[PDB]
Structure formats: C-alpha cells, structure tokens
C-alpha cells in the first residue's frame, strides 16, 4: 500500500547542488530501504544510493563524495543532495522502494513517478500559451479540432490537460521542438463534435513546474 | 561491471521472446527484471531469478545459470512491447542494471498520418510574432517529410520540425512549426503544409482572414 513521490523537476545551474526530495504515502518509512535512482542516454539506468531508517546509508563508488541521501521520518520524507553537478548529471531522478531484512534478494519495487532534472548554464524562462482556435461552423455534424500553443519554455517539461482531466478522449499532446535559440515549444490538440463548440467550454491547463508556472487558456471559437 | 543484453529484439505476435543478461558470475547471485515503457517508470515483472510478483502475467518467466540470466515472454502479446532491464549486484559496486533490450511486436500495418494545419493565432499576432503548426499523428512506419509552401513556392527558413515520436497507439506523431513576421503572414495568398508518407502526401493550407 506504499506511494512515493519525487519533488517537482526543475532546472539546476552548473556546479549548484541538485536537492531532491521523495515523499511516501501508504505506511512508515521502516520495512523500508529507501532508494534513489537515476535514468538517461549515456547513463543508461543507474543506482545512486539508498537510506535506512535510522540513518545508515549506502551509496554508488562512483557518485559518493558528491551524494548526501537524508532522511526525515518525522514527516515521511527521504532527500538526496547531489553535490556539484554538471551536464552529465542530467537525468529522470527516481525515488524507489527496496523490501527490508537481506539485501542479496533485495530489489526495487515501488518506483515514483521519476523527475527531469535539467543541468545547465542558462535560466528557467516560463511559457506562452496561444490559442489555437478551430472553426465557426460548418459540419452537419461531426468532428472540429481546437488547441493551445506553448511557446519558448525552458527547461523541459510541460503537461497539458484539458478541461482538469475532465477531457480526455481526443486529447493529443505532441512532443516539443528543441528550436534554435534552445527554447522548447510543443502544441496540444483536441478533436471534439463542431455542435459542442458555442455550448461547451474548453480550456487548456498548461503546467510547467521547472517555473513554477501554471496556465489556463481558454480556447474558443474564431469570427 | 557490465551487465549485457541484446540492445534489440523483436517477436511476431505469439512468438516466445528470449531476453539474456551476460556477466560474471553470476549464478551465485539472484537476478531480477524491469519492464519499462515509454514516459513510465519500471515495473517489477521477475524477482529472485525466477520468482514472479502478483499481477505479472504467467507468460512471463526467468531463469539464472553460471554466466547467463534469462527472460522469457510465451505466447508475446503486443501490449509486451517495451524495454526490459536486468538487475543484480556485484558488492564491489552494489547495484547494477544491464544495457537494456527493445522488444519489438511486429505486424502493425501501414497508417497515413492525420494533418492538422493551424494559422498564427490573433494574440500572437498582437505581439508580433507568427508560428503555423501543422501536427501529423497517428502514422506507421515513423518516417514522413513536411514541405512548407509559400503561396506556391517553396519555404526554406523559420522551418522546425520533431523527430516522430511513438504514441500509445504504436503509432507515430510529428509536429512542423513555421515562424513568420506578420507582415509576411499577410504578404502571401495563402500558406501550405505538405507532409509525404510513403507514396502519399497530404497538403493542407491556411490563408489570412
């Protein structure tokens, strides 16, 4: 019954210390060794180090000196502070669950959602969302396409729901363009019955935690 | 400390897949495999060797002698397509996962893609800026090519464009985005996006009104 959940991703400037921080729902943090992982190219899929309860840790030779893995059981929480990090660091951080007792049939079972942190030497810049408008009227019946355009964010990513979750059926969100100026942008589309538009209210929420900035554009349609 | 799997893999639709890990020992170690899918985090499918957690499917199965660890997928279904890791130790370095190994399904038959082709919205146009988006989805194999269209001649510049990437429907979707001035976005009679699939090619087109 046990839940974890990694803080928001984000972007870190070269040589600041990445901190991290995994939050567990469903139990107490003993019966429990506490992991952080991490994934990307180059790395493949790596472990960084685990944590007890009472505060024993064990870390990988090769991340050790620079990785400080804490706990803190007054609140369900377990942090990882990887000290001096550069473009190699940047990876999908993952917080995962190992089963206490032995560790030679140990295993990671229960994994977070797993967050993107970004190293580089540039700032974060928060998004601009435009609405991509459908049609009129026309269809006698069926089928008018509407979305929203987020533009120049940095850095990754960004989600995009529809309505709060309540839409979901039609829902396409594209990858984003890594454009020149090394800003991304991605676009989000919905297919929904031309009738609905004029009745029917639709909105993008637009989420880019790396910011700190959410976004609700409501689309609707043109003259 | 190297754990190696094939890189790739692929099995028809009822075909048994057969995944190894490659190191030493390892016999004298328990080894354990994830499943992974695209924007997902890994799943425990095998621990302990051989050992299957609750909800894993039956055809699943593992099996660990001296150098070698092996996954094995019976009767491969297509919702099994995905990146398997092998996981196991070496306590001069802990923790080690292998280099990964993409089961691909086969089948899957040829899908022309669905364009899309959006005009600048007015609120950009307000801030001086224009961006045409034309989005592809739902396409197989992921290898089309978009043109851009000036009344009728061809756009070099301002042209980005994504690497097709795999949906959930195991098909593909691209996005081409053109940045223009609002001045050249009225010049024109009329912009185009042209994406070639295969033989075939779509050619959608917007105009200033």
């Known amino acids: 019954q046990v839940q974890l959940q990694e803080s928001g991703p984000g972007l870190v400037k070269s040589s600041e210390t990445l901190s991290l921080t995994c939050t567990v729902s469903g139990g107490s943090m003993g019966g429990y060794y506490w992991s952080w992982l991490r994934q990307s190219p180059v790395k493949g899929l790596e472990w960084i180090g685990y944590?007890?309860?009472?505060?024993?840790?064990n870390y990988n030779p090769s991340l050790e000196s620079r990785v400080t893995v804490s706990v803190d059981t007054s609140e369900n929480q377990f942090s990882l502070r990887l000290r001096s990090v550069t473009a190699a660091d940047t990876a999908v951080y993952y917080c995962?669950?190992?089963?206490?007792?032995?560790?030679?049939?140990?295993?990671?079972?229960?994994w977070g959602q797993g967050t993107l942190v970004t190293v580089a030497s540039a700032s974060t810049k928060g998004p601009s969302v435009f609405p991509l408008a459908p049609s009129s009227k026309s269809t006698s019946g069926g089928t008018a396409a509407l979305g929203c355009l987020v533009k120049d964010y940095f850095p990754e990513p960004v989600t995009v729901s529809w309505n709060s979750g309540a839409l979901t059926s039609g829902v396409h969100t594209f990858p984003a363009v890594l454009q020149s100026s090394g800003l991304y942008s991605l676009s989000s589309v919905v297919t929904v019955p031309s009738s609905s538009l004029g009745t029917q209210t639709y909105i993008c929420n637009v989420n880019h935690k790396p910011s700190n900035t959410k976004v609700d554009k409501r689309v609707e349609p043109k003259s | 400390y190297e754990l190696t799997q094939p890189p790739s893999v692929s099995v028809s639709p009822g075909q048994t897949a057969s995944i190894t890990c490659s190191g030493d020992?390892?016999?004298?170690?328990?080894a354990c495999w994830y499943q992974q899918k695209p924007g997902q985090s890994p799943v425990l499918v095998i621990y302990?060797?051989?050992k299957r957690p609750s909800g894993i499917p039956e055809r699943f199965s593992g099996s660990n002698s001296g150098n070698t660890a092996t996954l094995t997928i019976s009767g491969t279904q297509a919702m099994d397509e995905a990146d398997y890791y092998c996981?196991?130790?070496?306590?001069?370095?802990?923790?080690?996962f292998g280099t990964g190994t993409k089961v691909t399904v086969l089948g899957q038959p040829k899908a022309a893609p669905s364009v899309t082709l959006f005009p600048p919205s007015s609120e950009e146009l307000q801030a001086n800026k224009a961006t045409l988006v034309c989005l592809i989805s739902d396409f197989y194999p992921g290898a089309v090519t978009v043109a851009w269209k000036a009344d009728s001649s061809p756009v070099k510049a301002g042209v980005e464009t994504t690497t097709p990437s795999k949906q959930s429907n195991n098909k593909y979707a691209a996005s081409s985005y053109l940045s223009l001035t609002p001045e050249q976005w009225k010049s024109h009679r009329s912009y185009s996006c042209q994406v070639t699939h295969e033989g075939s090619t779509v050619e959608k087109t917007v105009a200033p009104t």
């Open positions: 944590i007890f309860h009472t505060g024993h840790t």
């Open positions: 995962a669950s190992l089963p206490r007792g032995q560790l030679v049939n140990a295993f990671f079972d229960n």
């Open positions: 996981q196991a130790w070496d306590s001069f370095s802990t923790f080690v």
């Open positions: 020992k390892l016999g004298d170690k328990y």
């Open positions: 302990q060797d051989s």
